[PDB]
Design a protein around this ligand. Structure first.
Ligand SMILES: Nc1ncnc2c1ncn2[C@@H]1O[C@H](COP(=O)(O)OP(=O)(O)O)[C@@H](O)[C@H]1O
Ligand code: BEF
Ligand SMILES: [Mg+2]
Lengths: 81, 73, 825
DNA sequence: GAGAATCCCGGTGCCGAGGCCGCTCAATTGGTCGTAGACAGCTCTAGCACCGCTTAAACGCACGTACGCGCTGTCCCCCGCGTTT
DNA sequence: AAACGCGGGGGACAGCGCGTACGTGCGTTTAAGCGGTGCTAGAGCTGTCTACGACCAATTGAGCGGCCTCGGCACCGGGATTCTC
């Protein structure tokens, strides 16, 4: 029935994807705890970069975030990294 | 390596808290994908060194916490 | 391996008591067998049986235990059981013999087999089966099959007219090719118009009003060009998925002789079709017609563009709105001699779209050739639109059912305007006021129009509004009654709808519901369910088979389900619902033609009472302005409105033909048409046949002169008198007597009182019966057709005769010589 | 429980901080001139949302083995202390 | 203060055993990917006008540099207290 609707966004990053990333990172085995832990880290990374990107776009009085604003955010982040 | 639509939903949800009703260029979402994948892969390649240093095979969250400390965040 | 188990008959209670019905993974559906746990033991797949066991347990326990479960739920359970059993039985029925195979086994034995497709499965999960079984299971199907490769209706022999189309003159009556029934007068006139146009070589569109027969008209036109013109090349029809069954059915009804293929389904299935159906022994194509859908175009254009199609058509051209459509591009990558577009309505929202469509029909200089848009009202638009009309009118065939077919009952179009509920009003005002705070407990406001549009019909599309009403009844929300009350009162237009539906329930009407929104249709279906109503849904959620059976059920004249509930996008097109008489359009698209389509699905040929259409609009909401946008789109229609030579290869082919068939001049047209003989004058073949009959008689006179064997034709030594003369007279005698008694059915034949001598110590047992079957074979296929003679399973020969085992073609020949000599004696 | 190390208290010594004075440079004030930015309007790209259809990814559960963790024993090295450089 | 020598204790290193968690496989379900529907808002562009900033000159006050004087902090010594064996 209609009641089968549900929501949770952060789980969109899921164990198979994290596994793929770790395997690309040469990892052999992982504890399950890592899945929520990495999600936390990922949120913080997104949180920081979005904060820069939006602050560019609002200074330009835009309504649309551009790839240019994003890449200037990254050019600040990676050098500050 | 990460599904596009879920990630786009997540990034929009996070952006919502700075200011509502932003629109996004799709190329911006792709840039976010590439950046986040690169960051995660690097963090794994790092923390694997800590895991093997402890003579483990598994990654454990202690190792992520250590890595984030040592690179400084 | 364990495939899905079908049924069970009388956890530990189940394992001890019950026997299940097991399908097998590597075996046919007919090979399924009853087995218990101890019978099956342990094997790959056993968990599926356990999962079915769990299903049966939950079926058993909920049926027996719970007093909260009603008798009606037991009826629903029986209806599910039967609904599964119906399909699982019909999967036994064959629908297509694909290919014939010969097999030899480590037993030391050989068999004939068919690849066969079951009557509801794809071509994947087709299987080989033993021929001498399926022939008795479905003699109709195997005979119908073998007619096809026995046929001569093939691209190999389609006559090209690359110089110029042949003469055409308007056909006065339904040609004898067409078998399904009687064409309407206007249908025949449409066929004439298409023939006229194709004889001018032009592509075009058929745009007669929806349901006026376009499927029958198109298939009839195919039948005419394929039989009369001999345009038997590969032809392609592209189809919206939901209509694909009816198309295939229409093919089967109106022109079953045309072998056609439904290139569809999973990758392996299509691969098997390319393997066995497409090519003669890899090339040239073993089929007349492809039916397919746009999906498989976009997927497999890489393959399908390889074919030099003769003719191409599409059932719904409006899907091609603009030249940049990936479908439009890929179809233009196809090579085809002629194109034909079918539509309910060519005049979509913009003349630019019609311009792209005619560019699809014709090279760009044929198009409107000036991209200025239609002015709302001006002089230049009037001259330009009348210019375009005068350009295009020859290339459009269109007729209105009101003008054409006064037998059909008319339609009434009505709109009902309904005031918002309280919850509707407050939600609407809150979205109007951009109130993020209010919508926090309601939110992606990035499309204000969409958000308020869906709000205006119904509030439960916002995920708290249910709880927001139920919590003020926080105990009653468990009751059916208060759930129903809250749902119905949520939305004034639903209150109206329920009143009208109740009145129609009293009056026995049969009703279609349409909406754009699957969530809304879900809510309304759940409303019907809690009201206990009998209905079926249709939208993108239901794959082909379940929708096909749902439409069939609702078209069934007993069908208790009085309501059918559809999306506009999937359900709008080509569905047949002449068992319905009433339509509610719960909401409208931005495009009026979608509403016209949805209406027309009821207003078919064969609908037999006047249909009522009610369009439901929220009063004082944007959608009644969307209606004005629809009218503004609707405006556009009111504006636009050697033969004497003989070759040695032909001498050879004739000599072999007459060695098999005797006086070929009866068959001889077929012998040219099947390519056995190169094309020459029928009279020349006739006279040279008679000439060599006389020369054979002369050779017999020369034998008489000699006593009291090769001889040439036109110097070609490849001829002898006695074999021809005897074979011709013998085959005439045999065919005459077999017709004379048996012809009603030669399978009736027996040699009767004539008792033949036995075979001499052959490796196979033989009797008058094997003789009789062989004789019937030689009658069906002529002398010396030994491969076909052995292969025909109605003769039962297929085992008994070999390709150093004793009997072979020479022995068969001698046996026939004896048998015919004895019967002629 | 005793011994050593650390802490607290008082006085002396000096250097740095704090303030004052004078001169010079920078800032402030006023006027003129040019252009960049702001504001308004127009055109059309592209984003937002939803449906249709297909296919693989995901998800759940069960089973088996490997790795992680803890314990025990042994050997090495480094820390601590004293003397000499 | 660093270097060098010496002894004893503690930590590091290795092996073993056991249990749990992680990986793999199978079957089923759901969502993503791709294409299409439809519309409006926002970006992006262009033109015009006005106000603000820069430049130049003069004048005035504050800041900087130097000098002097006094206080606060550091160091040294003794006695008391705390921590470690
Ligand atoms: N020649 C005919 N004789 C009788 N009925 C016909 C004929 N042609 C079409 N029909 C009716 O029309 C229905 C099929 O509609 P169809 O014309 O195929 O839809 P469309 O062509 O608009 O896609 C069938 O149910 C059939 O009863
Ligand atoms: F237009 Be027909 F009714 F499909
Ligand atoms: Mg159609």
């Amino acid at each position: 029935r209609h009641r089968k609707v549900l929501r949770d966004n952060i789980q969109g990053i899921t164990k198979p994807a994290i596994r793929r990333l770790a395997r690309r990172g040469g990892v052999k085995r992982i504890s399950g705890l890592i899945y929520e832990e990495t999600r936390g880290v990922l949120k913080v990374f997104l949180e920081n970069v979005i904060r820069d990107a939006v602050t560019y776009t609002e200074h330009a009085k835009r309504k649309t975030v551009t790839a240019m604003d994003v890449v200037y955010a990254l050019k600040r982040q990676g050098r500050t990294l | 390596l990460i599904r596009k639509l879920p990630f786009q939903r997540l990034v929009r949800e996070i952006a919502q808290d700075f200011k509502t009703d932003l629109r996004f260029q799709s190329s911006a979402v792709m840039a976010l994908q590439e950046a986040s994948e690169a960051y995660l892969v690097a963090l794994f390649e790092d923390t694997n060194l800590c895991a093997i240093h402890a003579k483990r095979v598994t990654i454990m969250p202690k190792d992520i916490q250590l890595a984030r400390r040592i690179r400084g965040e | 391996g364990i495939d899905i188990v079908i049924n069970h008959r009388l956890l530990n209670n189940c394992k001890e008591n019950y026997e299940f019905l097991i399908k097998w993974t590597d075996e046919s559906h007919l090979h399924n067998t009853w087995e218990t746990y101890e019978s099956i033991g342990q094997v790959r797949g056993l968990k599926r049986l356990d999962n079915y066991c769990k299903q049966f347990i939950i079926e058993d326990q909920q049926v027996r235990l719970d007093p909260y479960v009603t008798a009606e739920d037991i009826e629903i359970m029986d209806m599910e059981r039967e609904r599964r059993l119906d399909e699982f039985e019909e999967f036994h029925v064959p629908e297509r013999i694909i290919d014939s195979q010969r097999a030899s086994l480590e037993d030391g034995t050989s068999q004939l087999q068919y690849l066969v497709k079951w009557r509801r499965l794809n071509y994947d999960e087709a299987t080989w089966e033993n021929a001498t079984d399926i022939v008795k299971l479905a003699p109709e199907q195997v005979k119908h099959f073998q007619n096809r490769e026995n046929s001569k209706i093939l691209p190999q022999y389609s006559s090209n007219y690359t110089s110029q189309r042949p003469r055409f003159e308007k056909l006065s009556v339904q040609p004898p090719f067409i078998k399904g029934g009687e064409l309407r007068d206007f249908q025949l006139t449409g066929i004439n118009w298409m023939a006229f146009l194709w004889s001018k070589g032009d592509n075009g569109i058929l745009a007669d009003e929806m349901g006026l027969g376009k499927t029958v008209q198109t298939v009839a036109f195919i039948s005419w060009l394929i039989f009369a013109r001999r345009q038997n090349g590969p032809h392609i029809i592209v189809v919206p998925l939901s209509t694909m069954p009816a198309w295939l059915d229409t093919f089967e009804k109106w022109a079953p002789d045309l072998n056609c293929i439904c290139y569809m389904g999973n990758q392996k299935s299509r691969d098997t079709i390319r393997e066995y159906e497409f090519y003669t022994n890899p090339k040239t194509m073993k089929f007349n017609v492809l039916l397919t859908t746009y999906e498989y175009i976009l997927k497999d254009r890489a393959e399908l563009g390889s074919i030099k199609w003769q003719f191409m058509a599409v059932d719904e051209a409006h899907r091609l709105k603009n030249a940049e459509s990936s479908l439009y591009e890929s179809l233009n990558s196809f090579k085809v001699a002629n194109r034909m577009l079918i539509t309910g309505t060519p005049l979509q929202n913009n003349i630019k779209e019609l311009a792209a469509l005619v560019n699809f029909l014709m090279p760009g200089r044929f198009t409107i050739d000036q991209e200025i848009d239609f002015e709302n009202q001006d002089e230049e638009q009037e001259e330009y639109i009348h210019d375009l009309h005068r350009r295009i009118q020859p290339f459009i065939l269109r007729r209105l059912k009101k003008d054409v077919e006064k037998s059909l009952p008319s339609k009434t179009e009505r709109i009902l305007r309904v005031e918002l509920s309280d919850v509707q009003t407050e939600y609407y005002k809150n979205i109007l006021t951009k109130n993020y705070s209010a919508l926090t407990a309601g939110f992606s406001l990035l499309n204000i129009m969409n958000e308020l549009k869906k709000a205006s019909n119904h509030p439960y599309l916002f995920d708290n509004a249910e709880e927001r009403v139920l919590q003020k009844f926080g105990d009653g929300k468990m009751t059916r009654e208060n759930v129903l009350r809250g749902l119905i009162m949520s939305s004034g237009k639903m209150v109206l709808l329920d009143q009208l539906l109740t009145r129609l329930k009293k009056d026995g009407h049969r009703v279609l519901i349409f909406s754009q929104m699957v969530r809304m249709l879900d809510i309304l279906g759940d409303y019907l369910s809690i009201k206990g109503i009998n209905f079926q849904r249709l939208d993108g959620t239901v794959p082909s088979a379940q929708r096909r059976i749902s439409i069939d059920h609702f078209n069934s004249p007993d069908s208790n389900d009085f309501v059918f509930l559809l999306s506009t996008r999937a359900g709008g097109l080509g569905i047949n619902l002449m068992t319905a008489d009433t339509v509610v359009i719960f909401d409208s698209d931005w495009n009026p033609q979608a509403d016209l389509q949805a209406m027309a699905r009821a207003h078919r040929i064969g609908q037999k009472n006047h249909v009522m259409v009610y369009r439901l609009v929220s009063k004082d909401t944007v959608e009644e302005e969307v209606l004005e946008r629809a009218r503004k789109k609707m405006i556009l229609e009111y504006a636009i409105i050697d033969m004497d030579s003989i070759g040695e290869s032909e001498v050879r082919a004739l000599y072999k033909a007459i060695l098999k068939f005797g006086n070929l001049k009866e068959i001889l047209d077929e012998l040219i048409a099947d390519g056995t003989l190169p094309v020459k004058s029928f009279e020349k073949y006739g006279e040279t046949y008679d000439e060599m009959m006389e020369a054979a008689k002369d050779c017999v006179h020369e034998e008489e002169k000699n006593r009291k064997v090769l001889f040439n034709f036109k110097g070609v030594k490849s001829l002898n008198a006695e074999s021809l003369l005897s074979r011709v007279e013998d085959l005439k005698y045999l065919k005459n007597l077999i017709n004379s008694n048996y012809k009603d059915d030669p399978l009736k034949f027996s040699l009767g009182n004539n008792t033949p001598k036995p075979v001499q110590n052959w490796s196979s047992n033989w009797t008058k019966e094997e003789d009789e079957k062989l004789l019937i074979g030689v009658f069906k296929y002529g002398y010396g057709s030994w491969t076909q003679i052995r292969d025909d399973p109605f003769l039962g020969i297929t085992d008994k005769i070999f390709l150093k085992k004793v009997p072979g073609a020479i022995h068969l020949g001698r046996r026939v010589d004896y048998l015919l000599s004895f019967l002629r004696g």
